[PDB]
Amino acid sequence: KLPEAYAIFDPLVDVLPVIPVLFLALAFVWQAAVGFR
Amino acid sequence: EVIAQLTMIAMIGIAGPMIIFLLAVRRGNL
Amino acid sequence: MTILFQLALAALVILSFVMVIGVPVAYASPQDWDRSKQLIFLGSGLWIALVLVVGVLNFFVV
Amino acid sequence: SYPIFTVRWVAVHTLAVPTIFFLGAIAAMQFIQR
Amino acid sequence: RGWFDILDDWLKRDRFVFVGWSGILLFPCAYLALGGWLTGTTFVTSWYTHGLASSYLEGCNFLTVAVSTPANSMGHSLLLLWGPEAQGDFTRWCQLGGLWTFIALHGAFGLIGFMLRQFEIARLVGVRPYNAIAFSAPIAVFVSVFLIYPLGQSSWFFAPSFGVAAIFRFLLFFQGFHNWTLNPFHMMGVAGVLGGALLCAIHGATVENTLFQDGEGASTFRAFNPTQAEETYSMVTANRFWSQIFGIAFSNKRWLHFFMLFVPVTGLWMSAIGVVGLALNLRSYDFISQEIRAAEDPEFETFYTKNLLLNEGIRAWMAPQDQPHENFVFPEEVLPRGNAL
Amino acid sequence: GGRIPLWIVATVAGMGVIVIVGLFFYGAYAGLGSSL
Amino acid sequence: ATNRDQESSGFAWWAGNARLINLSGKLLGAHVAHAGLIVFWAGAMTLFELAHFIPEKPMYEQGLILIPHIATLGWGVGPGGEVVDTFPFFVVGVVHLISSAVLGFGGVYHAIRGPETLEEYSSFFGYDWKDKNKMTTILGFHLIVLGIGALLLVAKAMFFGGLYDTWAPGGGDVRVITNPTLDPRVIFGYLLKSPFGGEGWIVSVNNLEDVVGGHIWIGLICIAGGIWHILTTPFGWARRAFIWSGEAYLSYSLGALSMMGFIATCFVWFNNTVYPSEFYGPTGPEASQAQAMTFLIRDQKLGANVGSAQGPTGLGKYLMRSPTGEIIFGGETMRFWDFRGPWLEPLRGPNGLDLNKIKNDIQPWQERRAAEYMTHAPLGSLNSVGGVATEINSVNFVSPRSWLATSHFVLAFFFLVGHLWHAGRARAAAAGFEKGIDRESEPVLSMPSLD
Amino acid sequence: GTTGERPFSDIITSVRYWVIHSITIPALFIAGWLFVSTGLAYDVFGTPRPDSYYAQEQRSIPLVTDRFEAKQQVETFLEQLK
Amino acid sequence: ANLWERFCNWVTSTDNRLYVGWFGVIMIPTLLAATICFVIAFIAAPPVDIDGIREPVSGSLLYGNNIITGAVVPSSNAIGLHFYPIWEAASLDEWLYNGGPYQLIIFHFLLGASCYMGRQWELSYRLGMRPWICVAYSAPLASAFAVFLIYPIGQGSFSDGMPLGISGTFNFMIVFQAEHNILMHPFHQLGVAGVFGGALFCAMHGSLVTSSLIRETTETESANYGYKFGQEEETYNIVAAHGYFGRLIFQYASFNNSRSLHFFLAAWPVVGVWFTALGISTMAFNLNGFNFNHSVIDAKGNVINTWADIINRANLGMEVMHERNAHNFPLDLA
Ligand code: CLA
Ligand code: CLA
Ligand code: CLA
Ligand code: CLA
Ligand SMILES: CC1=C(/C=C/C(C)=C/C=C/C(C)=C/C=C/C=C(C)/C=C/C=C(C)/C=C/C2=C(C)CCCC2(C)C)C(C)(C)CCC1
Ligand SMILES: CC1=C(/C=C/C(C)=C/C=C/C(C)=C/C=C/C=C(C)/C=C/C=C(C)/C=C/C2=C(C)CCCC2(C)C)C(C)(C)CCC1
Ligand SMILES: CC1=C(/C=C/C(C)=C/C=C/C(C)=C/C=C/C=C(C)/C=C/C=C(C)/C=C/C2=C(C)CCCC2(C)C)C(C)(C)CCC1
Ligand SMILES: CC1=C(/C=C/C(C)=C/C=C/C(C)=C/C=C/C=C(C)/C=C/C=C(C)/C=C/C2=C(C)CCCC2(C)C)C(C)(C)CCC1
Ligand SMILES: CCCCCCCCCCCCCCCCCC(=O)O
Ligand code: OEY
Ligand SMILES: [Cl-]
Ligand SMILES: [Cl-]
Ligand SMILES: [Fe+2]
User: Fold this and answer.
1) Which residues bear the site annotation Tyrosine radical intermediate (chain I)?
2) CB G319 within 8 A of CB G327
3) In testing the pocket of ligand 5, which one of A6, A8, A13, A19 has its CB within 8 Å of the most ligand atoms?
4) Rg of the Cα trace of chain A?
5) Testing the interface with I: which of E17, E245, E333 to mutate, by most I Cβ within 10 A?
6) Topology, domain I186-315
7) Domains of chain F, first to last
8) DSSP annotation string for E178-193
């Protein structure tokens, strides 16, 4: 468990590991915006 | 609870496209 | 000061979210770079201070 | 001046409208408990 | 200009999805085979035919859903909806296996329509129909495996069921009961399929790595014009490379591409023939000389005898559940098992 | 005829399948077919 | 439009990062930003593990790969590997996560806003891929950083609390290392061991003294090599041997990482010293040996004489000889007799397993460990059903040794392909035919016919 | 070339398109959801609910064993669940 | 100049009928050693105690095999992963009994085949070609490493490497399904898409180019004579092939760029076989196929069998029978 002081943040901690893959997906959103020039 | 996780990941998730959207409104350096 | 600790931590979390969006937008919009580079300078120091604050307050709640 | 209803239109809709109906059915199934 | 010629004009209009006369057969049957599979794997059980769950509704996933074969007590019935078993009752039709013959028969006629489409389009455009000819091997496979094989057995029950894991079961059944890996028609089929994958990869890689420099970009795809007259890669350099790497090389571009048609097409045809044999249980199951020696000589062992012991395990451990209509009751003491396991 | 930018419909469509498939993988662990 | 499009840069969007090859500043931001991602994952994942951590369950029942790396360094753990204080896990997590923010800031700054190329801004930070002197200088710097890092592990082991030692008397404990092995005959003798069974090359390192001593040697070797490359330029034989380009340097590192990934794969699978089985679960060899011990113990309790029990094949049911004569566990585990582990070595005499110690000396803690390890063998399904492939659903388990070995084989294999890809291209580009054959001077057309 | 229909990139970026399909797609999805939640899909297809595979104290499967009495057999299995 | 430069020019000569090359210098002796040993062993080797239980399996033609049943048998389980060269044996007779030839053969072959891949890169560099044919060969090469090297490593014994024989291959495949449920593993499912797809696209491309050959011959000659080795113009009308195939499906499901088309032909089977090689290599570390055994249960808790449970019944039969004298303890953990 997190130390009880940080317990209200358990749900945020639960989702942080997936953020690195969002950067990969973000690159594609970006290239669509510029039309894959 | 799980909605707590889902609202977190929804807000984190929309953060990315928003930067593109804003730089495309402002005609930024995409 | 239990509530005060979680206030600094939420402050830190909110500030991070704001600057996660603000810094890339400010960096790529050269129109208002001078207007904005002061704010990223402020937010940056505001951010470091919050880490230190949460860092020391942790030892009074943990 | 393009047509709105074509052979193509029927073709894409013969697949697409059953697909979405089925996805909704399958989505609801994830909440069936035994 | 009769009504027939006017219908012919509209059927052969150049549109986004070409129709043709063959479309009248192809599209109804293909859509209904497809839709029948999606309907059965989403909503329909196999409880009364097989003793199995088989749909998303029952909790199966994409790998374990199936439209399963009808019960063995149906024999080779067409299982028409209006026929004598279901008697027009759609719900009972589903429970008795009617979707299986529904998919299999509309699918057979859909395949006919697709080949007729290849003929029709090739004729209108003015090209040779070698692609229609290549499609006879998938048809050979489908007919031999889904129709001829169960027609020679007791019932449709033993055809493949339409599902991912159901087909894996089919694979393992054919090993344990037919010793199908030992069959030279399957071995030729294997050679044709792996040789086709080999030809596919080696030809694409050879062309991509003997390209001429026809542009200045680092992505080489833009330096090709589909109306250009000239070859885009060097046959001469490709030939020298493979001659010195492998000893021989293609030198005739036409023979090369005919060979790519021939190899996998011939492979599937050979495997179809072996499955027609298995319809009658005419297996290549044993080598008689090996059995005579092994029976007399308890010290003789080869990989052939080892594999039969595996087949014997498959058969006895899987049959009671796989063929529930037989009511096999095998006490533990008769199950073949090695030590400890 | 182009009033909504293509990258936006792409992202929204992409995020929508992500959710549906995610829901399917959730159901692998809950209710019917979870082994529980 | 400084690159950023195919017409100016020559590369399509799907090879767009190749537009950065001669843009040192934007390239720097890419590297620093990526490093932010690595450090970020280290932080978020540790906190995720900690949030899910239950101190009463074994770590290896809980899907943890990073907390076991921290525990191995001697933080948070007491005797037997029992978790005594989770706070260091929290610190490690938080400090990495916070660090990734400043790394991320520096990368986004350099990639978006900063100078696209550094060579005008500073003759120190700018570089040309063909400057063999500047290239070895940067290499020299990073060598020094690496040797320092190796010596940080030495610092931890000798001065800052020690390391977890699965071999320590009484069941394992954190232990300060006071006599590292410096004898180069031992240290470099690992590099000359064969990688085959019973030898295992450097994967066989089985005590913390050799581990700490090897990192003293490597630390000094890297610092000395760094100074060497800073002060020198490559000699003539080296210049004529290599391709000197950005992509070629990339390809050499891809080959190096591939090799390293394959070695790590075998490290986590075979070594139970720097991957303690208390944290990572038993090895495959270990769990298979533990099954034999379990039934030896059970049957011996019932009255069986395990030394004289002939099995069905004629080989001993419980005990047999290896091909060089050592007494070993029988059955199919005969293949695993090279296994060494703290729970089994008390039964070992000079000829292998000792029948007198087997008859009299087996303790309840060894019976417990053998049962625990046999029922936590690294076998299981992709959806984490533990056990052999025919087991029913119930046990939700896949060993971290399986997760770590499989993932790093996949990564090592794909980096070998990357090496081959970029090595071939680097050679072709340096010679000037990476974009295809010149129609007007096709080399083969000037060669004699083969026949 | 073009065979005469409106381009797809055109239609899906158009406001009129999304106006129409902001309703049709969610409606079709809701209809399918209802198809299962009302329990109707069970009765249309004859698929057992989780409580109607077996009778309470039976462990044998209701396999049809006759070709022409089949529909009759299934209905008799069904009435033993009552 | 000097002799060494003369030797280097001959090694790297593009005028040799078969390219030698520096990779060729290692490849030739190792492939020769592996080939000669394999041929002699397949014909004449006495039986091998593959499983270390003193139960020799006869693999060679002279000892009662045919082409389909014969094999070079893997080395004894008693050896495990230990190196067993000829000179570690007390005698050739001992080396034969314990399966020595298998080690000699696979080690020389893996080395020679690795250098075959390098030799492909090397000649491509001497000829001025693009370099990536050898990348395509890395898929079959990786597959061979998986069944001869990786899987023994993960499982701890060369006795579980794939045998060098027709029926031995089948035995390997069946036992693999028993212990890893490889059919339910997505990398193998991707390997099947890779090879089915490759055979499909092989036929498609063959038939489409053949369907659009340009009339260059009369009907009493082979159409193959319409192509002359080295001619500048193409012999088929890709615009016609696109016009046919675009109408068979729809216009954009069809390629009009030859380079894009041929890159697709290379990529699909190569990537597919990478995944299946990676499948064997990770199942070497016992990360097995999906397990849905007893995944569906009813409201009371009765198990409702699916097709996965039927697969498990077959798997169970392979398990209890394979290596019937080799297990003394209830779990088969390697
Ligand atoms: C990341 C680490 C790294 C890298 C990339 C380099 C890269 C380089 N070094 Mg440096 N070096 C390093 C670390 C590194 N070095 C360290 C830490 C030291 C301290 C010992 C040195 C000491 C050093 C010296 C003394 C020299 C170089 C030189 C060179 C250049 C040629 C290298 C070469 O031919 O490869 C290797 C290629 C070979 C043909 C070597 C032999 C290969 C055989 C097959 C290996 C067998 C012997 C092996 C070294 C040990 C066996 C271990 C085995 C059991 C696994 C190259 C620019 C040379 C140069 O030009 O200096 C300016 C040179 O003379 N380096
Ligand atoms: C290309 C179209 C096509 C084809 C080939 C088939 C073929 C088939 N369907 Mg499918 N079906 C179709 C479209 C099609 N269907 C459509 C659109 C639907 C949706 C309503 C269905 C719904 C459906 C169901 C629900 C079922 C089938 C079934 C069947 C099978 C039995 C059909 C049968 O006995 O027909 C009998 C009827 C005829 C052969 C037509 C006779 C034509 C006339 C009477 C000839 C009269 C001669 C006349 C004097 C000559 C005039 C000359 C002219 C110049 C005037 C067969 C495999 C059954 C099945 O699969 O069971 C397993 C089944 O249960 N179909
Ligand atoms: C780890 C992944 C990674 C990284 C670090 C980079 C980095 C880079 N890319 Mg590559 N790229 C990647 C993945 C990556 N790429 C992938 C997967 C693809 C394939 C889709 C590409 C395709 C690609 C192309 C086609 C091109 C690049 C280019 C570039 C460079 C300039 C980017 C630019 O101007 O964007 C401008 C974009 C924006 C201004 C939009 C906002 C971007 C920011 C960084 C979003 C970050 C948000 C983040 C949360 C910030 C908060 C942190 C804060 C708290 C400090 C840059 C160094 C360009 C180049 O080489 O230029 C010469 C170029 O043309 N890349
Ligand atoms: C390998 C990483 C790396 C490299 C080579 C550079 C290189 C450069 N940067 Mg960048 N930068 C980086 C990371 C990096 N930066 C990071 C992480 C950040 C975010 C904090 C920034 C933020 C940044 C800004 C905002 C600016 C630069 C600028 C510059 C230029 C002048 C730098 C200088 O003299 O600093 C001065 C150097 C010192 C005072 C020496 C001490 C600096 C470090 C931080 C001390 C601590 C070292 C640490 C203990 C080592 C281990 C770190 C970690 C692994 C534990 C130069 C091209 C400037 C530029 O390009 O102008 C246009 C500029 O304005 N950088
Ligand atoms: C640490 C932390 C933090 C931070 C965070 C961050 C850093 C974030 C980021 C975020 C991000 C970074 C995100 C992103 C997103 C993305 C997305 C969501 C994407 C999507 C995608 C898609 C959907 C795609 C699509 C497409 C296209 C476009 C084209 C082609 C096709 C396709 C379909 C593929 C915070 C503040 C919270 C606080 C707490 C802690
Ligand atoms: C049988 C029958 C019939 C018919 C029916 C039909 C016609 C139906 C249809 C149906 C349909 C038509 C359906 C559909 C469905 C679909 C679905 C269910 C889908 C899903 C999908 C998905 C889930 C996908 C996704 C993905 C993936 C997975 C990966 C990649 C990405 C993507 C996104 C692609 C009738 C009436 C005659 C009556 C009699 C009987
Ligand atoms: C360039 C580029 C790119 C990339 C980017 C990147 C890669 C970046 C990175 C970035 C990053 C890398 C970021 C970072 C961030 C971080 C953060 C923002 C952090 C925060 C933290 C916090 C806030 C914490 C809190 C806490 C505590 C203190 C305690 C416990 C609880 C918690 C966890 C809540 C892309 C591809 C997109 C596009 C193109 C261009
Ligand atoms: C830490 C430790 C240790 C130690 C370690 C050591 C001490 C290491 C060393 C290492 C080393 C000492 C290594 C080295 C390596 C090397 C290499 C790996 C090489 C490579 C090479 C190359 C790659 C080359 C190639 C080539 C040729 C041959 C010809 C021409 C071309 C070229 C140049 C490309 C021990 C185990 C005790 C224990 C545990 C811990
Ligand atoms: C005793 C039977 C009771 C009758 C119940 C009604 C069942 C009739 C439903 C038939 C729907 C049409 C299916 C066949 C149409 C297609 C045949 C063809 O096109 O060749
Ligand atoms: O699968 Mn079953 O598991 Ca791999 O070992 Mn234990 O038995 Mn034996 O030697 Mn070949 O085989
Ligand atoms: Cl066996
Ligand atoms: Cl055993
Ligand atoms: Fe071709």
Assistant:
1) 151
2) yes
3) A19
4) 16
5) E245
6) Photosynthetic Reaction Center, subunit M; domain 1 (1.20.85)
7) 1-36 (6.10.250.2070)
8) H-GGG-HHHHHHHHHH
